[PDB]
Structure 1
């Protein structure tokens, strides 16, 4: 079930049982890793990297071909973004909702959605504080939201 919606969607991605690298994939581990460096320097999030590599370079799983995940590869070089991507997009959405909400006062639906989005922000932030991704004094403030994101 959805965290903040009454839906029970099963739309997922079924990873194949085959853990072996495909034999028709002639790209090697360094070939994929330099591609990760090139696209990250272009400005693509790790979610955007995996979809592009799979679609265009025909790689099954980056973990399968390189032995490590995309985010682990990005941080080992050190060019990975300081904010986690999902937390970044949640805050970025909250800024768009807040900007639209101040323009339209009577959008009670949007004000309802803002609480839902911000609740996901504060719950995800608590998880990252446990894993020390964020500083212990980090905080999502509505006033500073438009600055920290984008």
Structure 2
């Protein structure tokens, strides 16, 4: 089921068997790379970049056409962000809830949900410190 919820939701992406590039795809590996770079400069997230490239330009899977993933391409050049996507998003959700809580002292629900977010930050931070993508002195405030 979920991390911090009783729901057993089964809703994710089902990537097809055929890894083969579609015959109708005109864009080449280098052309896609140039597109990813141009998108990345506008200040976007690998998630958003992948969605925009899937919707607009008709690239089913970047890793199939190029042979490398979005964060990996941006890492290889050096247009990758300092904090990983998911940790950054948890921190901005945490500070948003804390900003709400600072006015509302009675909102017990907000306090409970903050505790649940903080737990996700710490559990993800520990993993990133284990893989040595963050420094070992990295704390949360």
Tell me the TM-score normalized by structure 2. 0.99
Query: 1:1-150 residue pairs with structure 2 within 5 A?
Result: 1-141=1-141
Q: Which runs of 5+ in 2 are unaligned?
A: none
Q: How far did 1:94 drift?
A: 0.3
SS at match of 2:102: helix
Q: How far did 1:89 drift?
A: 0.2
Q: How far did 1:74 drift?
A: 0.6
Cα deviation code 1:83-127 (max 9, x no counterpart): 000000000000100000011111100000000001000000000
Root mean square deviation, CA, Å? 0.5
Distance 2:34 2:45 in 1: 15
Distance 2:50 2:101 in 1: 34
Cα deviation code 1:4-34 (max 9, x no counterpart): 0001000110010111011111101011101
Q: How far did 1:46 drift?
A: 0.5
SS at match of 2:99: helix
Tell me the TM-score normalized by structure 1. 0.93
User: Which structure 1 residue ranges, 4+ long, deviate > 4 Å from structure 2?
Assistant: none
SS at match of 1:83: coil
SS at match of 2:23: coil
Distance 1:21 1:119 in 2: 41
Distance 2:39 2:93 in 1: 23
Distance 1:33 1:118 in 2: 36
Q: Which runs of 5+ in 1 are unaligned?
A: 142-150
